[PDB]
Design a protein around this nucleic acid. Structure first.
Lengths: 96, 154
RNA sequence: GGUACGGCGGCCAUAGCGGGGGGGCCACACCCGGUCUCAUUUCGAACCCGGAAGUUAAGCCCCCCAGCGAUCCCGGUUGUACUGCCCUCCGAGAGGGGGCGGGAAGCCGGGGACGCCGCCGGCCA
RNA sequence: CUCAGGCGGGUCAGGAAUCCGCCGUAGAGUGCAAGGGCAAAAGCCGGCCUGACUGGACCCGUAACAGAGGCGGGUCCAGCCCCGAAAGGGUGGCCUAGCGAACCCCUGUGCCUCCCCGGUGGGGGCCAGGGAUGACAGAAAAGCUACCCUGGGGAUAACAGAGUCGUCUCGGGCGAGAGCCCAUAUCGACCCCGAGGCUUGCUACCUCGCUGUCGGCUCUUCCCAUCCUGGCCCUGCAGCAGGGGCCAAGGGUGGGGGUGUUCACCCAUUAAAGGGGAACGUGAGCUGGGUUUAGACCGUCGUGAGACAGGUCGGAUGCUA
RNA sequence: CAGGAUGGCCUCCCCGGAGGUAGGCGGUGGGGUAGAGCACUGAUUGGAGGUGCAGGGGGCGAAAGCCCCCGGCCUCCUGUCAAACUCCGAACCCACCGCCGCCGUAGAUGGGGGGAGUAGGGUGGCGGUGUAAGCCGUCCACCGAGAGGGGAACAACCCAGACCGGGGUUAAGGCCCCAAAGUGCCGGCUAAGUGUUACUCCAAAGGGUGUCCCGGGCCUUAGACAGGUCGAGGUCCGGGGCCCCGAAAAUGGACGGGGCUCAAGCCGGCCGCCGAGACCCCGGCGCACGGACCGAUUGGUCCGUGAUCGGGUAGGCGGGCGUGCCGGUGGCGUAGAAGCCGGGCC
RNA sequence: AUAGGAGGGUGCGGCCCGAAAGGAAUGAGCCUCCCCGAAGGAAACCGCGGCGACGCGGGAGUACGAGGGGAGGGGACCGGGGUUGCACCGUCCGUCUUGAAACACGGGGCAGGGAGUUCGCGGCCGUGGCGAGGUUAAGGGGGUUAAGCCCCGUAGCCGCAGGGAAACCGACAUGCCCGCAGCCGGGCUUAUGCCCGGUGAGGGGCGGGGUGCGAAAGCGCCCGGAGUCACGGCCGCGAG
């Protein structure tokens, strides 16, 4: 039986957390800052449910191209299409 | 050091990744040889395409003979002692010696094609093209023994 | 510059749990009393207001351990289990094997580990 | 503020009423399925409130890559507000389900408009909310055909062929046990390994611009896993006979009763009255009893036309090689 | 649902101007599969210890109660598991950055426009399902849409991807004859015509003092076994290679056939020789791109590069050949036009 | 009249034909000799290694080698064609289909006929005219054997200004930045060519502007002049 894709489809392990990492994460990831042109990895924090990108884009690396509110505008290349996402800094990590 | 790489197997039943690796190495057809460096990138490419090629270390004398006989310029023109002397100031033997030592590179000779189209070996290959050279085949790394094969293929 | 002094943090167990010894210049506490501020779906138990008669008994601070938990290094099991590419290699089949490239988990033995580190201030000098 | 559960102690009070202390990483709870997340909370108990709001942008998903009406979600600007000391939080439910085009109609709210002009009644238009299509990207909708017709399909069934052998038939390994003792004279549990394509089934690979079915008669031929006929071995083989097994396919394996029957049952003989393959051999050889059209009767089901792998009577067989 | 639309994949033309990434090395991130394991959730044999636990049943006692067991629940030991378990966890895959390599100013990545075809796929490896065949996905290798040389023929397996005329060497594989190339060489094995099968086709459990060997043993050269006397090695066990039994079908017959036994079979190797349109060379044609020169309508001659051009179904694009008639231009024919039969040349 | 394959393919050999159009007495097949020769490529014999099949060094890159030339002798064939023989290879044509020699369908032979046509609208491209303009339609006059030919014909249609359902309102003739080709200057380069610095049409991007929704912000569409007509071609829709 075909199943359509939803936000939490097949995310039992991808969006799970380590048992020893249960609770609030350290505030550094929440309060980190980025600059235009910087490249950041998309690593979702399951506890924070706001500003979360689609899990299909988890683990990719994107380019910051602006900012709106408290969310960063991240551009990715899915195949040959440019996709723009609004991701909270808690779901982001600097490259290197 | 310098590595001589000769394609062994044909152009059929080849998957896109290995086909493109061979195209990048410029080994488009069978019985075609190229000379490359021993850099990690080239070693990785050789590992990727190791099931359709053979490779080894090339000696100065073998390289000199290869340039003298099967070397060709743009336009499929023969490479001659007069031309090499007029363009570099030394004979083929000295050019090959310097290239093997690593002082200079083949590209330093203008209008020299980077691929040598060899002749099928005399007495044929002494192993099946379905097995590696270590177990009696004609594929993969074979070390200094590639000089004998290059001599046979001219 | 010292200090078995405190406040705000970083990594978030190699830092935890459980044990042993040591301390009260200042500082941190226990603690004396509830008119005023604040509160009990009763209780000044907590929270809050007012202080020093006593105490270092313990929170806290200094030092130590390897019982549990965690986790880093080395040696054995072991280049074992497993696996990427090629194969006119074997096997009735299941499945295995050769060449090149990767390579555990658990267990056993010997070490490590009872946390590092940053900004400022108090007291003394 | 901290749960489920457990331990020790308490008047009625016990397994379970209501309490007190300790252990207790969540083993509780969430409005609801499952997954994930939540412990000085997102859980429990309280105070206030309605942001479950108005005017709009950009983006992700349904629908990767790679097009989309509708729908859901995310990040924001402005307005008027809620909570809080403040930071900060609020565009419904901790995240993922609980729903839906065109046309038409109802409601709110302001504006535009109705054929030469002006007023009145009424109509039309723009924006927002609602009434449903579950076949859920949205026709309003019951059956028989055996009197059937047409266009196709071996993209797709029934017979046969092909693959497989679950099943069918026939062998083997081990040996618990039965056989006065004795496993193997004979039978051989519970388990396990195979052969054939002779029953049935599964698949849908060839054949639907046509390869005529079951049964019987006539005739030809082949396999052995042999019923008799030839020769042997073991025996719980005294003889006459039996049980098990081996070599062996030259010959035979017949006649009748009911039934369309193959088969099975029965009768009298016989050495025996073996099982099968050949397009389930053989309809350009025969017969046409059964099966499967068109007529008709009975039973049952259906309001009905009708239907029945339910009976029953009748129902064509082309040929100049 | 034998049919269509939007996309994906093909082709032709044009704009844009400086980059791009199929392969590889190193780095920064993501993962929870194979394997493994019990630290959670659910299963699981027995034993030990602790708990009266609504267990439950008996001894014991008018009754309240104790003493026995069995059961339930915890800790440990012991012996086992998981697609809807995970304290751990690869190979490997993906995103991004630097570089090597390759492609690109003879114009790529990218953008616009015109025309399609395609909506039954098959074989092969992997995953779920099924007794199996098969069904359903996935991998893009081969046929579809693919020539030539082999596997006896064979879609799919091996070599191999192909313009035309020649010469040579090799690939798959092959060398007793059919049939080009050895009755080739050394060491060993098989006695079964086993075999003469890379894969498309291939019979098992179970057994064999049948042979050739390896490794462990106990006795062990006047002493060990076969029958207290001889007087040289015995008696077991676990394995490896080949072979043997287990092994019955229908027209007469299948290692392709003949046939083959220190092989013409099988093992561990080796040496020569044959064998493709593949690889190399000579001459020729066309095509793509650039250049020079030259045409009064799309062009023509020549030159330079092509290891990185030459198979082809649906389909796209360019050139060319042929027929009737009309406006021009230049002509042929009764000394024989068109038409018709047989030949030469391009 | 002892021989097997869809009737053919490659090569040649018998028998036969062979004036013309093909070469050829200005020399054909043919015989002899000489020179250079790409890729490739032996052996006699000498020495050595190996148990052996055999190999290594010299001979030797020699003889030979596709082909490219020359000289001598002879004097009429060669190319081509019909049939047939030998060796090897080859299971017809069209079609649906994953799959055709097929026991799947259409296929006795020959000749003749036979199936992307026309109009309307629309999107594109190849070319030509004119150009902020383009272009006629019906129709009229002249001339003509004639329907050919010449001129007129601005009604009409598209474009020049877009936004909105409507009322209605109503825009850059360049303010600025990157920048290809071309141009200018400089360096290397024999030259080509490359590099560097400016200007840069066309191109891209900002800024500003009109209108619709709004309280505004902000967004959608649009704005710094290229369209129109004609011939031919591809395609979409409707007509058989």
């Amino acid at each position: 039986v075909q199943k359509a894709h939803s936000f939490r489809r097949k995310t039992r392990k991808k969006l799970s957390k380590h048992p020893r990492r249960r609770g609030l994460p350290p505030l550094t990831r929440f309060l980190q800052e980025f600059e235009v042109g910087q490249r950041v990895h998309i690593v979702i924090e399951p506890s924070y449910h706001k500003g979360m990108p689609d899990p299909r884009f988890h683990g990719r690396t994107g380019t910051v191209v602006g900012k709106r509110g408290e969310a960063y505008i991240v551009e990715i290349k899915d195949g040959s299409k440019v996709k723009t996402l609004f991701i909270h800094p808690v779901h982001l990590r600097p490259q290197k | 050091a310098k590595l001589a790489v000769i394609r062994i197997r044909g152009r059929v039943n080849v998957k896109r990744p290995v086909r493109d690796t061979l195209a990048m190495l410029r080994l488009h057809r069978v019985n075609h040889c190229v000379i490359v460096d021993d850099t990690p990138s080239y070693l990785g490419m050789l590992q990727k395409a190791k099931d359709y090629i053979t490779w080894g270390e090339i000696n100065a004398e073998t390289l000199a003979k290869l340039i003298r006989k099967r070397g060709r310029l743009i336009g499929n023109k023969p490479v001659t002692d007069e031309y090499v002397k007029e363009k570099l100031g030394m004979t083929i033997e000295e050019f090959a010696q310097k290239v093997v030592n690593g002082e200079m590179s083949l590209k330093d000779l203008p209008n020299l094609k980077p691929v040598f189209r060899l002749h099928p070996p005399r007495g044929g290959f002494r192993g099946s093209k379905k097995r590696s050279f270590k177990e009696g085949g004609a594929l993969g790394y074979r070390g200094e023994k590639i000089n004998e094969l290059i001599e046979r293929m001219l």
